[PDB]
Design a protein around this motif. Structure first.
Motif, short mmCIF file in Angstrom:
data_model
loop_
_atom_site.label_atom_id
_atom_site.label_comp_id
_atom_site.label_asym_id
_atom_site.label_seq_id
_atom_site.Cartn_x
_atom_site.Cartn_y
_atom_site.Cartn_z
N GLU A 30 0.90 -1.21 -0.09
CA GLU A 30 -0.38 -0.22 0.29
C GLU A 30 1.13 0.93 0.03
OE1 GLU A 30 -2.19 0.69 2.96
OE2 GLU A 30 -3.79 2.22 2.63
N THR A 31 0.70 2.07 -1.22
CA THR A 31 1.59 3.05 -1.37
C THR A 31 0.85 3.79 -1.80
OG1 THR A 31 2.28 2.52 -2.95
CG2 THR A 31 3.85 2.10 -1.73
N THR A 32 0.96 5.33 -1.79
CA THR A 32 0.22 6.36 -2.73
C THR A 32 0.11 6.57 -4.31
OG1 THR A 32 2.31 8.08 -3.41
CG2 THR A 32 1.66 8.30 -1.17
N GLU A 33 -0.15 7.36 -4.39
CA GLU A 33 -0.88 7.27 -6.04
C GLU A 33 0.05 7.45 -7.03
OE1 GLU A 33 -4.91 7.21 -6.70
OE2 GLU A 33 -3.74 5.82 -7.79
N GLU A 38 4.44 4.93 -11.03
CA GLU A 38 5.39 4.40 -11.05
C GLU A 38 5.82 3.37 -11.24
OE1 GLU A 38 5.74 7.84 -13.64
OE2 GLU A 38 8.14 7.30 -12.74
N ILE A 39 5.89 3.00 -9.52
CA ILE A 39 6.55 1.90 -9.80
C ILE A 39 6.21 0.80 -10.60
CG2 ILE A 39 7.33 2.09 -7.67
CD1 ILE A 39 5.35 -0.30 -6.00
N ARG A 40 4.85 0.27 -10.92
CA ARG A 40 3.34 -0.42 -12.03
C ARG A 40 4.98 -0.87 -13.03
NH1 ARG A 40 -0.92 2.03 -14.69
NH2 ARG A 40 0.68 4.42 -14.48
N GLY A 108 -8.30 5.91 -0.34
CA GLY A 108 -9.21 7.26 0.64
C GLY A 108 -7.99 8.07 1.04
N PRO A 109 -8.32 9.25 1.52
CA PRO A 109 -7.23 9.90 2.31
C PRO A 109 -6.24 9.63 3.36
CG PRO A 109 -9.03 10.64 2.58
CD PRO A 109 -9.11 9.44 1.31
N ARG A 110 -4.95 9.57 3.32
CA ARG A 110 -4.77 9.72 4.74
C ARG A 110 -4.77 10.56 4.96
NH1 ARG A 110 1.85 8.15 4.18
NH2 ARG A 110 2.11 10.41 3.11
N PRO A 116 -3.34 10.64 -0.93
CA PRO A 116 -4.85 9.71 -1.59
C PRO A 116 -3.54 8.38 -2.12
CG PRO A 116 -3.70 10.80 -3.20
CD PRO A 116 -3.33 11.70 -2.43
N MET A 117 -4.18 7.43 -0.63
CA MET A 117 -3.57 6.25 -0.66
C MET A 117 -4.08 4.74 -1.34
SD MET A 117 -1.04 6.50 1.16
CE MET A 117 -0.54 5.21 2.35
#
Ligand SMILES: [Mg+2]
Ligand SMILES: [Mg+2]
Ligand SMILES: [Mg+2]
Ligand SMILES: [Mg+2]
Ligand SMILES: [Mg+2]
Ligand SMILES: [Mg+2]
Ligand SMILES: [Mg+2]
Ligand SMILES: [Mg+2]
Ligand SMILES: [Mg+2]
Ligand SMILES: [Mg+2]
Ligand SMILES: [Mg+2]
Ligand SMILES: [Mg+2]
Ligand SMILES: [Mg+2]
Ligand SMILES: [Mg+2]
Ligand SMILES: [Mg+2]
Ligand SMILES: [Mg+2]
Ligand SMILES: [Mg+2]
Ligand SMILES: [Mg+2]
Ligand SMILES: [Mg+2]
Ligand SMILES: [Mg+2]
Ligand SMILES: [Mg+2]
Ligand SMILES: [Mg+2]
Ligand SMILES: [Mg+2]
Ligand SMILES: [Mg+2]
Ligand SMILES: [Mg+2]
Ligand SMILES: [Zn+2]
Lengths: 123, 112, 93, 43, 53
Positions: A30-33, A38-40, A108-110, A116-117
RNA sequence: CCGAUAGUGAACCAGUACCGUGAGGGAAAGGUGAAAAGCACCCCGGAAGGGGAGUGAAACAGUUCCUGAAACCGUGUGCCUA
RNA sequence: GUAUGAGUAGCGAAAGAAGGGUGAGAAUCCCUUCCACCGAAUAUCUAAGGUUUCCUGAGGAAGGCUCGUCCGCUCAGGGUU
């Protein structure tokens, strides 16, 4: 035009290597948007390199994977590393699948800073 | 009689101008929709207003025996409270005032 | 002055209770009493044979109970070790 | 950059102490004035 | 670089006419039966696209 | 003669807190109720805080608590306004 | 005492990431692995100075330029031979 993530060139490459290796090991992080978006690409290119299965491809991938232990197996205790898992477990799973080894799901937001996570997993 | 109920949270450490921007969203709406609105608004005043609203609904149902499904938010407003006076040291040996403000939050629910 | 004047009271804590097993007893003594006076106060009160005495000086702690500031009483702690062939001080019965 | 107050116990007691005040006519005048005003700390 | 005259109440409120914040873009999950954000995973039944995750 | 910006600096743990190396300078701060009878118990909340119930002549007297003006901040509406 | 400037300037040199745990609530608290920084110091002693700031168990009103389940902060007990 890729994406600068608020950090310099050497710092950015270190971040991408950490997240790419964390996704191979745990398979669900679980990371940010923007960070996940990018890591995709790097994870999918790395899995393609694993699909090739060559020794040259193995060296190419080893120049990116962080050297850390996934888990230990009683073959006699012998740990298995991330590259071994990439070339022995993850790559054969998608032998019959061409592209798109990852999916992104929004959360949803942190609380602390409203970031946005999302959750990104390899299936 | 007594077709409405209310709840108040007094002297809450939140500036009134930052709560009077969230509390303007839920005025005159169904309680379910208002709870949903407060759930998905990523401001810092949402949990407090949500807690006050749920307390108002609870004591409307318990004390006065009304229906949850048939309630709307009539009134909702934020009132000022006592302020705490602090200082912040600026440059060249002089300080500037800092106002840590509080507020009073009130919500009233009733039958449609 | 009197032996019972320079020995005030025992100290009952976790450390003192721990060290009671080693024939060491922790006491509270006057602030104007040297360790020789302590050694002669004990052995005269409890009829034992003292081997050595160590002393410790404590300051007062700054306390507060609302707008009111003050210090606790300064102490003087002493540890007395009896010889192997002597008796034992009971402390708690 | 260093400042005007460099603390030291001995210097403070030797310059502003009680015995230094009591060793002079004018120091005793200062002590008497401080007693008259009713201050909690002398010297 | 300093105000010449203080601002009245009318002008202050007129400026603040645009400082509101918008309503969230939510609807109801078919499985949950209560509200959730569009294109997001609902947190109650833990499902997206009719499949648990 | 004064009646809490008054009258002593000090009606309240005041030459105190605070400032200064030192001599020295030096504040702010009164009032629940006749009587604590200072809110058992129920509900929302982690708590704070509220809504009932009760004591009270009064709780819109609830541990800066008699009275509670103005600036200042809000909610609703009759008339007007691009 | 309270306004306007205004939800504006600022938030005081610096590399973080993910997975578990606790909890009413976690970017900020604990644990693990990887990465990065100083290394005639950003390491180890000891004077001056400060005067309980040291340890354990509880706590989240205020203080901490955010948050806090944490703290050189609040409470209760201890600690200098
Ligand atoms: Mg470089
Ligand atoms: Mg100056
Ligand atoms: Mg300065
Ligand atoms: Mg000694
Ligand atoms: Mg002493
Ligand atoms: Mg004393
Ligand atoms: Mg008056
Ligand atoms: Mg006066
Ligand atoms: Mg001083
Ligand atoms: Mg009275
Ligand atoms: Mg209560
Ligand atoms: Mg009550
Ligand atoms: Mg009542
Ligand atoms: Mg009555
Ligand atoms: Mg009266
Ligand atoms: Mg009043
Ligand atoms: Mg008025
Ligand atoms: Mg401007
Ligand atoms: Mg600007
Ligand atoms: Mg900083
Ligand atoms: Mg975690
Ligand atoms: Mg280096
Ligand atoms: Mg500590
Ligand atoms: Mg804070
Ligand atoms: Mg402490
Ligand atoms: Zn759902």
């Amino acid at each position: 035009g890729y994406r600068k993530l608020g950090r310099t060139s050497s710092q950015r490459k270190a971040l991408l290597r950490d997240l790419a290796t964390d996704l191979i090991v745990h398979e669900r992080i679980e990371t940010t948007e923007a960070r996940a978006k990018e890591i995709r690409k790097v994870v999918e290119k790395l899995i393609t390199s694993g699909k090739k299965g060559d020794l040259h491809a193995r060296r190419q991938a080893a120049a990116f994977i962080r050297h850390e232990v996934v888990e230990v197996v009683q073959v006699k205790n012998r740990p298995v590393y991330a590259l071994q898992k990439l070339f022995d477990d993850v790559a054969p799973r998608y032998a019959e699948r061409q592209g798109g080894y990852t999916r992104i799901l929004k959360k949803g937001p942190r609380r602390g800073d409203g970031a946005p996570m999302v959750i990104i997993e390899l299936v | 009689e007594v077709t409405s109920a209310k709840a108040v949270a007094k002297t809450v450490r939140i500036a009134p101008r930052k709560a009077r921007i969230v509390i303007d969203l839920i005025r005159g709406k169904q309680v379910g929709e208002a709870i949903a609105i407060l759930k998905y608004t990523p401001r810092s005043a949402s949990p407090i207003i949500e807690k006050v609203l749920k307390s108002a609904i609870a004591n409307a149902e318990h004390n006065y025996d009304l229906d949850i499904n048939n309630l709307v938010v009539e009134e909702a407003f934020v009132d000022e409270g006592p302020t705490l006076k602090r200082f912040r040291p600026r440059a060249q040996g002089r300080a500037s005032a800092i106002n840590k403000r509080t507020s009073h939050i009130t919500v009233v629910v009733s039958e449609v | 002055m009197d032996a019972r004047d320079i020995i005030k009271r025992p100290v009952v804590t976790e450390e003192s209770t721990s060290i009671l097993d080693d024939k060491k007893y922790t006491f509270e003594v006057d602030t104007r009493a040297t360790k020789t006076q302590v050694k002669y106060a004990i052995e005269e009160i409890f009829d034992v044979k003292v081997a050595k005495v160590n002393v410790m000086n404590y300051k007062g702690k700054l306390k507060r109970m609302g707008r009111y500031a003050g210090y606790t009483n300064k102490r003087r702690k002493a540890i007395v070790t009896v010889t192997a062939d002597s008796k034992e001080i009971q402390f708690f019965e | 950059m260093k400042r005007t107050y460099q603390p030291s116990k001995r210097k403070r007691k030797k310059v502003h102490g009680f015995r230094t005040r009591m060793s002079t006519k004018n120091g005793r005048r200062v002590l008497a004035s401080r007693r008259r005003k009713g201050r909690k700390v002398l010297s | 670089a300093v105000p010449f005259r203080r601002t009245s109440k009318a002008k202050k409120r007129k400026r603040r006419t645009h400082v509101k914040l918008q309503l969230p873009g939510m609807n109801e999950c078919s499985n949950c039966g209560e509200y959730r954000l569009s294109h997001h995973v609902c947190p109650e039944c833990g499902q997206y696209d009719g499949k648990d995750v």
